[PDB]
Write a sequence for this structure.
């Protein structure tokens, strides 16, 4: 059972991550009611394109390692930067056993103002940036997200960074096969991460070029 | 390659990158991917540059010869059907991925011909490496009955996605407006990728490179 | 690779009312060298020079064809073929064998004798013409030559300047290529005169 | 590759040398198979491949050159000609149903003035030819395992100006180098030279 | 791809999704898979768009020639038997799964499944394409032959939706077309107003309880939705 | 690569080219191919540069450890045999290293070709790498056992040079060493294009 | 599933008499897209004086980067405080690439820095661990485009013209800017920015420089 | 194979076909695919019979040891998380598609799909095995959560039937089992009395008009059934 | 297969002969590599494979026999023994991670009475051994391309009773038949005989 496509984008004093609530066993859209965005401790979210199985094991192993280190020794919880470094090595270690975590994770989190957003690959390829996408998001949504960061070079507002996700999510929905029009949005701010109730997006299907008579082969 | 079409109220706007690659090299920075099919029909080409050029020419020719026989402007459906039947006969070995725009008597017509001979007559289309990135910008911003200005500025935007967010597409946006009356082919409508750092002229003075033998011949 | 077998590199370069086309001299089978006196340039007429690179068999076969076609032109048409035509004729000939191709990459220099405008064409093996203002290259040193030509080459250069950067290009690339070198034969075409130079390089 | 042909061209003769070794898998049948065919009075071709394509190609040439001498009232075609004919035939073959003639030729001859009016090359002509049809004029060439030992040994010693006598001494060293250094027992070499006078069979060297 | 003809008393209804995917990316969002052969004889097209389009045009041409020379209408049989021959001759080269449906005055509403092999099976209703496999059970349950023209359309839409909601390959618009004695009625249900979708169905509102907070109790509550909680 | 050593009365010449080409493109034109292990041992690297530079440097550790333990320099016999036993244990681990361990010890000069497959051969004359076939050509012409140190280096330098001239993978700089009872000395370090204008002045 | 993924990009180094310039592009490109335009992972500081540029798979460059730091950090403790020279780290790189030759790091490294004299030096590796000291060098997509240019403008091998005086820190930088600019324009997988590190006796001085965006 | 758990208010119903095929031959006609882990926690088993039986026994054993030492009932979660770990460790070696359903007093009626990969997805209802693919649409249409124990059983049977009637791999008996506060009620619906089958459905009585006599008229009548006619 | 070993056993000596040819691909390095190792005063083994496994197997045996002569206070083990030890080692190798020692041995010796009490075989012993560990006592054996030419030539001429002198004449014909008939230039042969007196190196034959 595979996850669709994640997108995430830094705004002023936070990160948005967004993901279809769908697992897909090959072509078949098996489950449309899956919460794919998980919270890692008090500061951070994670979410993965690819084998929900290998993500469910990695996100379990990490969320343990956090709430252990915190509860056992009288320490500050791990910063998102650290949690993500632990996730990155955990994944690299698994590709070095030829037993890979066969899933592209996006990862968001915010300690103070310190705002952190990163991807990681099956193989350990890790990259911070001001916008991430995995799966089709990378070929579709990233182009639009990068355009919305070029155009507001001081940084996006939370309303702007929500409208530009909603625009990408609409386009993922049109163009990615294994997607549905029911997304959640994680929002990392100072207070911590909040995952939205599932929402759909408005979709335009009644172009005059999409009518029957024009598209007819004969 | 990334090439794009949109239907606007008056006619069609095609778009193309210009970067013609050999493997992981830029052979030509400014190559023209929007070929003349007919006076009222342009035809952008992605895929094997040979096949795109040869198919395109063979048909532009066939059309021009047929445009004498009839004494009538070539219809876009005719051009489409010739690219189809030709590309289908070669089972997609002829790897030409065409966007065929034009405007006949019936009105604005914009199709894709995928290499196998598939045809999708649509209001906005993309083909080539950068297609997916372009089709994002196109799906977001496209609306019905755009003006020529909106429609160019969109197409340019959609190419610029493919140009930056894909390697094989690059350099500048060629844009072509086919309206009912005419065909405006604007080369470098947009130059996003100008010169970064001016050329440091290395000076090799005549008689530098050592020459064993020489033969001059006058005319 | 079948293209890299016989080795060779060719490069053309446009200046003001002149172009310099320049080959290497090597002929190989893979790594072993046969001859070091095999320039890859042919001269169609006064105003066209084309290098062929790739499988030497086909360089030689496809050359004899181009020679048969540009002679049959010169009799029927009663005039020297022009760059434009010649380059488009070559694409037609290469594409005629889309399936079962000639393993040859024709680089074509040309210059309209009236106007003085330069025309270059670097056709790939199935006749995909690439016709840039500046310069073109092909063969084994192609990656390395694009690197050289891009740095060294400026727009409106004079025959002597151009040759010295075309020669430095072809040489400084064939240093970094196994399958090219043993000098180079340049050929500096102007409206006025055609200067054929044999350049000394490495013996490697 | 088993059977080494050597050839080199000097002021006033081409010398050609070709393995005697006739092999069936790993079995020496004999060391006395002449692989240097004579196409003309003044032209011979050290062909080295498997016997089938070697014979069927050197016969096809030898016939279609004799056929030209008939139709051209005893006119002896230049070396450039037959070399370019041989290669045009070898090239035609890599794009037919048959496949390539799998034969590596060292075509050698001596263009003499054919009449009063001849202005063309007087003197000796050696051409190296791959099975594909890679024709190339050369001062000295080789085919077969031994080739690369001889090719370097000639680079060293071969000058363009040595006698008929210094050519026997050199061709002995070229032959003796294939004997010393190749496992495949190329133990007898048929050596034929082309001069102004015609083809002569050098028996001294082997 | 999801396609289906069904016959009602007078005639037939074809219905189709409008998505052609190159696997996982949606190349076209609004493809007409219903392809006119004659006035009243439409074929649906599953599998390689190229091959069905080339066959639809090749047959639509012969039916045109036929229709002219016989100086009468074409029997749907004729369309299906032409389409069988061309799907059969090339059965190795192509990947084409056709449904010829239509109306002629002699037999009324005829439907022929021509799947891959070039079989040709006159039926009450045919399912083609990737998203067929979902419908088979859905038909067996909810299909009830002797429907009105109105219901058969409203049904086929409902069906094509149930399929394209589970199939990845299928999705977008639900083009139908009713072919009977009267003039062909095409209608194109856009996704935003589709009769069924998993997104808007109240079954799947309440999320799976996967994430689940760090608790002192085996008692499953809901997902963890705030870092503060 | 081309790489040749040979034994004569005066001692052992080792000549090499100085190019490491990945088939078509040339990485480096300055690879030092004579590995200097002890001061009485010359390993030559040909084949997988990585495996040689590593193993011939290991050999170097084991030769030095022997000098410490046994209070006296290793033999070349034993030096080669160490390398041969390392390459044998790793024969089906896909090593690639045609090496030559040359040296002078108690029992005269000794040259040993050592393969990837654990092979170990007492050679009087030998050449490794793509252009070996070319070197051997020249080298079997001029080679006697009674050469002067001058003519031996002249012969080796030519031999490498004529491989550089023909082989595309062999080229660059024609380094020569001598191995004598007093250790080894680097004779020359001639560029192979200057060499062409010495050996063929016209 | 392939455990290797070429993450592209180009590194170059040029060693003068006082300094080394070390350049590595910031394009980290995955499979047919690009992940980042500001990836600094290419170059890595080991000591004040010694840097390790690294191409190919990022994930492996990043493992090796740590693995090398934790053998430098060990060397610091065992040899009482003293930092390892460039020449030491260089051989350590070769030794550590080889211990993993039966599942190689898919990473074409260059250890760059100053030797004990102050003369700048660079070493190059292949995945397996083949040390070659060079003076000017370039691994990656634009190896083939840059390395012939540098070959011409430094060695001046085929020029009658008298060799230029020496080449200062600022000229060698200006040469590399020009080279990379001509590699971004002609290679597809090179672009965005280039991080230059100018190691001298005084300390490193990094200045990022803009290329073509495509 | 067709398997499905559904939860009603109090507890769950598992249901299964009873056929294990070696492709096209039916090795066993009456397999119990519902496999007791504890008193109230059954797993369904799709895929290699060997691998699911070996895992069902290996888990049934740990749950037995667990249930003893904690001196209390097992949470269904515990059964599913044990089954996930074992399906995940070996995910490459085995071919196992499990559904752990059950009742514990804490959470009540829990259902976990553990498909191939070793995902583990707490759901209202899970479908497994070849014959799943048919049901997905059938559920989306006819399933309506908040069913009584009685209806959920009568439903699951109807479902397993619609699946096994279309799937070849699936067929035979429809074993169910209800796991709630009360004592487990297994029942085994034999095929001859199944709720749905294509054979007995009046939709499919009238044969396809394939054979069709030699006639002087394009008018399709029926099949040719006598040589005399 | 390149490098032919020949051996045959008569009334009062075993004769062994082994190719001198040391080859790198298709290149004759030399014709002077002794492949007949001496395991004892009275036992030798014509081993013919690639140099690596040939040396590392004939050394391993030669050491583990010397090690036995130490621990057995100068006692010279029978031929039957070392042969059976060699094969048990070769056989053990085809079911280890290493894989088969890829070496084809013609083990030969001369059992002398080791003390007063010895009742065992007095006289010469020849054993053919495959790389697999197929040990077999034989009158005459061979390995390599040349094998089957010699094997038949011995069938013809070899009698059990010929002199030391008729064994030189025969072993010359066996060596000369590999020279005439195999392409691979097995041009020099190391011939060693085992007698009551020990191993003697026959220089006459090659």
């Amino acid at each position: 059972a595979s996850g669709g496509s994640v997108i995430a984008i830094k705004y002023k004093g936070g990160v948005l991550m967004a993901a279809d609530t769908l697992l897909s066993y090959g072509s078949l859209a098996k489950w449309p009611n899956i919460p794919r965005i998980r919270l890692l401790g008090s500061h951070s979210a994670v979410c993965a394109t690819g084998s929900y199985a290998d993500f469910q094991m990695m996100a379990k192993q990490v969320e343990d390692n956090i709430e252990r280190q915190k509860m056992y020794h009288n320490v500050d919880e791990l910063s998102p930067s650290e949690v993500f470094s632990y996730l990155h090595r955990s994944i690299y270690q698994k590709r070095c056993d030829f037993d890979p975590c066969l899933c592209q994770m996006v990862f968001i989190g915010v300690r103070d103002g310190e705002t952190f957003l990163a991807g990681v690959d099956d193989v350990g390829t890790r990259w911070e940036d001001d916008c991430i996408a995995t799966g089709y998001g990378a070929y579709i949504a990233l182009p639009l997200l990068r355009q919305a960061l070029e155009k507001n070079p001081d940084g996006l507002s939370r309303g702007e960074a929500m409208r530009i996700l909603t625009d990408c999510l609409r386009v993922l929905f049109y163009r990615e096969c294994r997607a549905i029009n029911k997304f959640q949005v994680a929002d990392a701010a100072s207070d911590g991460v909040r995952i939205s109730e599932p929402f759909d997006v408005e979709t335009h299907w009644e172009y005059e070029g999409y009518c029957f008579e024009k598209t007819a082969i004969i | 390659t990334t090439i794009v079409g949109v239907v606007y109220r008056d006619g069609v706007v095609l778009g193309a990158d210009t970067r013609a690659t050999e493997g992981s090299i830029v052979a030509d920075k400014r190559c023209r991917k929007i070929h003349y099919m007919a006076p009222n029909i342009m035809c952008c080409g992605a895929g094997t540059s040979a096949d795109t050029e040869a198919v395109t020419n063979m048909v532009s020719s066939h059309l021009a010869l047929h445009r004498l026989e009839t004494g009538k402007q070539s219809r876009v459906l005719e051009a489409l059907t010739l690219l189809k039947r030709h590309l289908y006969r070669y089972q997609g070995h002829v790897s030409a991925a065409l966007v065929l725009g034009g405007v006949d008597v019936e009105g604005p017509f914009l199709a894709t011909i995928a290499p196998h001979g598939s045809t999708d007559r649509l209001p906005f289309v993309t083909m080539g490496s950068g297609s997916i990135a372009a089709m994002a910008q196109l799906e977001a911003a496209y609306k019905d009955n755009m003006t020529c200005e909106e429609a160019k500025e969109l197409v340019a935007s959609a190419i610029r996605k493919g140009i930056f967010n894909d390697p094989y597409s690059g350099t500048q946006v060629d844009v072509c407006v086919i309206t009912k009356d005419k065909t405006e082919l604007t080369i470098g409508y947009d130059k996003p990728n100008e010169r970064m750092y001016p050329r440091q002229e290395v000076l090799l003075p005549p008689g530098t490179t050592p020459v064993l033998k020489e033969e001059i011949r006058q005319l | 690779s079948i293209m890299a077998y016989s080795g060779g590199s060719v490069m053309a370069m446009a200046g003001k009312e002149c172009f310099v086309i320049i080959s290497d001299n090597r002929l190989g089978e893979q790594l072993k060298t046969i001859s070091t006196e095999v320039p890859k340039l042919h001269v169609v007429n006064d105003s066209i020079v084309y290098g062929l690179t790739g499988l030497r068999t086909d360089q030689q076969t496809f050359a004899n064809k181009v020679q048969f076609r540009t002679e049959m032109y010169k009799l029927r048409e009663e005039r020297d073929i022009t760059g434009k035509a010649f380059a488009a004729m070559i694409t037609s000939m290469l594409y005629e064998a889309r399936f079962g191709p000639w393993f040859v990459e024709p680089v074509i220099g040309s210059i309209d004798k009236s106007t003085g405008e330069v025309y270059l064409c670097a056709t790939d093996l199935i006749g995909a013409p690439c016709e840039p203002e500046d310069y073109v290259c092909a063969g084994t040193a192609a990656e390395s030559l694009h690197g050289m030509c891009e740095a060294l080459w400026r727009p409106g250069m004079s025959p002597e300047e151009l040759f010295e950067i075309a020669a430095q290009a072809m040489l400084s690339a064939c240093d970094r290529d196994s399958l090219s070198g043993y000098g180079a034969v340049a050929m500096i075409v102007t409206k006025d005169k055609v200067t054929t130079r044999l350049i000394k390089g490495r013996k490697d | 590759m088993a059977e080494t042909a050597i050839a080199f061209r000097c002021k006033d003769y081409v010398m050609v040398a070709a393995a005697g070794l006739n092999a069936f898998y790993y079995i020496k049948i004999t060391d006395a198979e002449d692989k240097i065919t004579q196409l003309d009075t003044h032209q011979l071709v050290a062909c080295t491949g498997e016997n089938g394509p070697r014979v069927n190609f050197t016969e096809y040439i030898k016939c279609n050159l004799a056929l030209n001498r008939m139709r051209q009232h005893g006119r002896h075609s230049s070396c450039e000609s037959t070399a370019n004919f041989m290669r045009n035939c070898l090239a035609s073959a890599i794009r037919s149903r048959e496949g390539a003639y799998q034969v590596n030729c060292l075509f050698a001859g001596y263009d003499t003035p054919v009449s009063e009016d001849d202005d063309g090359v007087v003197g000796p002509q050696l051409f190296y030819m791959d099975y594909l049809g890679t024709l190339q004029a050369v001062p000295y060439g080789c085919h077969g395992y031994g080739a690369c030992f001889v090719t370097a040994l000639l680079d060293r010693l071969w000058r363009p100006d040595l006698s008929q006598q210094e050519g026997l001494e050199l061709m002995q060293k070229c032959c003796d180098e294939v004997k010393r250094r190749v496992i495949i027992s190329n133990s007898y070499f048929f050596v034929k030279a082309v001069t102004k006078n015609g083809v002569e069979v050098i028996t001294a060297v082997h | 791809t999801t396609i289906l003809a069904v016959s009602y008393n007078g005639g037939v209804v074809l219905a189709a999704d409008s998505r052609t995917s190159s696997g996982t990316y949606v190349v076209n969002r609004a493809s007409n898979k219903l392809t006119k052969l004659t006035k009243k004889i439409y074929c649906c097209r599953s599998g390689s768009a190229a091959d069905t389009q080339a066959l639809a045009e090749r047959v639509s041409n012969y039916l045109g020639s036929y229709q002219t020379d016989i100086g009468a209408g074409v029997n749907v049989a004729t369309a299906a038997n032409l389409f069988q021959k061309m799907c059969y001759m090339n059965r190795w080269n192509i990947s084409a799964g056709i449904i010829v449906a239509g109306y002629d005055p002699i037999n009324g509403g005829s439907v022929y499944s021509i799947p891959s092999g070039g079989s040709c099976v006159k039926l009450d209703y045919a399912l083609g394409g990737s998203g067929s496999i979902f419908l088979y059970s859905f038909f067996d349950a909810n299909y009830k032959p002797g429907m009105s023209k109105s219901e058969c359309v409203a049904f086929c839409q409902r069906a094509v939706a149930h399929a394209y909601s589970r199939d990845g390959s299928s999705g977008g618009l639900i083009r139908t077309i009713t072919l009977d004695a009267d003039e062909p009625e095409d209608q194109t249900i856009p996704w935003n107003r589709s009769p069924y979708c998993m997104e808007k169905d109240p079954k799947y509102v309440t999320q799976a309880t996967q994430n689940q907070p760090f608790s002192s109790s085996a008692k499953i509550t809901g997902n963890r939705m705030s870092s503060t909680g | 690569t081309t790489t040749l050593a040979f034994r004569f009365n005066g001692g052992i010449i080792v000549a090499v080219d100085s190019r490491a080409s990945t088939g078509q493109y040339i990485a480096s034109q300055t690879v030092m191919k004579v590995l200097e292990i002890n001061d009485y041992l010359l390993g030559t690297l040909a084949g997988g540069a990585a495996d040689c530079q590593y193993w011939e440097r290991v050999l170097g550790m084991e030769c030095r450890l022997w000098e410490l333990r046994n209070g006296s320099r290793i033999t070349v016999a034993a030096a080669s045999k160490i390398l041969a036993n390392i390459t044998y244990a790793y024969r089906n681990h896909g090593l690639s290293m045609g090496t030559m361990v040359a040296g002078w010890d108690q029992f005269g000069p000794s040259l040993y070709y050592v393969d990837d497959k654990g092979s170990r051969v007492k050679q009087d004359l030998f050449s490794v790498g793509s252009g070996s076939i070319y070197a051997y050509g020249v080298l079997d012409t001029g080679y006697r056992k009674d050469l002067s140190v001058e003519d031996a280096c002249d012969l080796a330098r030519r031999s490498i040079f004529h491989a550089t001239y023909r082989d595309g993978a062999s080229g660059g700089i024609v380094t020569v060493y001598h191995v004598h009872e007093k250790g080894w000395t680097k004779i020359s370090r001639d560029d192979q294009t200057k060499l062409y204008h010495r050996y063929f002045p016209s | 599933w392939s455990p290797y993924q070429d993450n592209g990009g180009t590194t170059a180094a040029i060693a003068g008499k006082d300094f080394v310039i070390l350049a590595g592009d910031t394009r980290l490109n995955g499979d047919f897209c690009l992940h980042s335009r500001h990836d600094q992972s290419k170059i890595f500081q080991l000591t004040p004086y010694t840097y390790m540029a690294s191409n190919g798979m990022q994930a492996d460059r990043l493992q090796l980067q740590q693995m090398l730091k934790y053998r430098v950090k060990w060397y610091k403790y065992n040899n009482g405080g003293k930092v390892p020279s460039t020449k030491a780290i260089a051989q350590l790189m070769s030794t550590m690439l080889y211990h993993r030759r039966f599942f190689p790091y898919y990473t074409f490294n260059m250890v760059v820095g100053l030797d004990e004299e102050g003369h700048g030096v660079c070493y190059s590796y292949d995945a397996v661990g083949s040390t070659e000291p060079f003076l000017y060098g370039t691994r990656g997509s634009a190896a083939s485009f840059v390395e012939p240019l540098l070959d011409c403008l430094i060695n001046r091998q085929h020029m009658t013209s008298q060799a230029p005086p020496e080449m200062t820190k600022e000229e060698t930088l200006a040469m590399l800017k020009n080279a990379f600019t001509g590699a971004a324009e002609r290679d597809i997988y090179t672009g965005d920015s280039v991080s230059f590190f100018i190691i001298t006796k005084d300390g490193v001085q990094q200045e990022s420089f803009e290329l073509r965006k495509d």
About this structure: The radius of gyration of chain A is 18 Å. Chain A touches chain G at residues 92, 95-96, 98, 100, 102, 119, 121-129, 138-139, 142 (CB under 8 Å). Residues 52-72 of chain A form the longest helix (21 residues). Chain A has one domain: 1-218.
